[PDB]
Amino acid sequence: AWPKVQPEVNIGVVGHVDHGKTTLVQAITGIWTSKHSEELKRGMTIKLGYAETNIGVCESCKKPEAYVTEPSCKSCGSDDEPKFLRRISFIDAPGHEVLMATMLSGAALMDGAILVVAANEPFPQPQTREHFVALGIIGVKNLIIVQNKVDVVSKEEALSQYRQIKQFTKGTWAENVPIIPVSALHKINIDSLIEGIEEYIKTPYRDLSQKPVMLVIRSFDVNKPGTQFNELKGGVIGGSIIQGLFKVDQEIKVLPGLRVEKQGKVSYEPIFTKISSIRFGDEEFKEAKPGGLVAIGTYLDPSLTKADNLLGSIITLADAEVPVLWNIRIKYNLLERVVGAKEMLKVDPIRAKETLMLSVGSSTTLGIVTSVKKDEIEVELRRPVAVWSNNIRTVISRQIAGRWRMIGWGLVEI
């Protein structure tokens, strides 16, 4: 039989627009990501397209048709349970995305991604061009492009566009990202896509002994109304554990933690508690490894987690040693120009004393530059950040126009 495991990789599905990639996940998995009642029935995630699947292969059958997301090979005249390969998860932002300071999170929670482009529209649309650029800044690796809606266009018109795409990736990091053509609506060529995810978005190497760290992307008071006081449950933390391993019953802390205002002056107190449960989807486990979105029960005053109070923090083992710097040094690489408004605008170098909005892990906190050099800048943060590792990639964003737009990335120095 196939196992009851947690997902081991997160794949971000970055689409052009609407439910034309909400149904692509829905097609690979069979459980709509936008407006999924899986948030009501174990799976609370706002704005989150979070769905998972098991991936197997019928050894007895030919590829790509040999891949299955189900324990069955009937698809190809075989009653042999197929081989299980892994369980994966997809993440994507609903319809007119809104992936401004939300997509930046995917940076940490994304072992690879999928950029879906409409095959019956001119390539590359505006949104597509920039989506492309955001994946460079995010530093996302494994990428696959998907020509959606190819059954609505001629093999030649489909092939023609293919060319433009390859002629766009020509020169950039995605020089050779594969382009897989499908039809998410009427399910055309979905097998090749599963074979593609298997070949191009392999699960990255994991060191299960590394300092356990988890990025909290959601948190809340799981209790319902009318609950009798002596029957309440501790706050629940939702997020993706990045490195390390977390077992139920461990002593953990939350960084930066709880904001304190004593003596008129603002300070942060790390929040300690213990793990009461680990849950990946509908299934409860005992260990949480990097892989999908995990819901963690705690002994925290629900009042501390209610309405994502903790979003942006990071969970680490109680004893871990993680600094939280109100001031950080960054080895950056700015962007030449950024598309927007009329024609693809130019980026001004880092001005001293200007306000930037940087994002470490799942925390985008803005600060003030205090020092500027060719490769390094020093920023005075509005809120402290927990620097769990040394070269934690950061995304620098300036408010060009009225929108906070990405102007480059950088590595945090310590």
UniProtKB/Swiss-Prot annotation:
| Region of interest (G5), ranges | 183-185
What, per the annotation, is the impact of changing D18A? Reduces GTP hydrolysis 8.5-fold. Completely aboloshes GTPase activity
Q: Which Pfam families match?
A: eIF2_C, GTP_EFTU
Span list, region G3? 92-95
Show the segment(s) annotated as G2.
Answer: 43-47
Q: What is its EC number?
A: 3.6.5.3
Which UniProt keywords are listed?
A: GTP-binding, Hydrolase, Initiation factor, Magnesium, Metal-binding, Nucleotide-binding, Protein biosynthesis, Zinc
Q: Which cofactor does it need?
A: Mg(2+)
Map out region (G1) in residue numbers: 15-22
Please cite one Gene Ontology biological process associated with this protein: formation of translation preinitiation complex
Q: Where does Zn(2+) bind?
A: C58, C61, C73, C76
Chain residues that bind GTP? D18, H19, G20, K21, T22, T23, N148, K149, V150, D151, S183, A184, L185
| Every tr-type G domain range | 6-205
- The enzyme's main class, written as a single word, is hydrolase
Region annotation (G4) ranges: 148-151
The record ties this protein, via SUPFAM superfamilies, to: EF-Tu/eEF-1alpha/eIF2-gamma C-terminal domain (SSF50465), P-loop containing nucleoside triphosphate hydrolases (SSF52540), Translation proteins (SSF50447)
InterPro entries, sorted: eIF2G (IPR050543), eIF2g_C (IPR015256), eIF2g_dom_2 (IPR044127), eIF2g_GTP-bd (IPR044128), P-loop_NTPase (IPR027417), Small_GTP-bd (IPR005225), T_Tr_GTP-bd_dom (IPR000795), TIF2_gsu (IPR022424)
Q: Which CDD domains match?
A: eIF2_gamma, eIF2_gamma_II, eIF2_gamma_III
Purpose = eIF-2 functions in the early steps of protein synthesis by forming a ternary complex with GTP and initiator tRNA.
| HAMAP family xrefs | eIF_2_gamma
The record's subunit annotation is: Heterotrimer composed of an alpha, a beta and a gamma chain.
Could you tell me what this protein is called? Translation initiation factor 2 subunit gamma
Q: Which organism does this sequence originate in? A: Saccharolobus solfataricus (strain ATCC 35092 / DSM 1617 / JCM 11322 / P2)
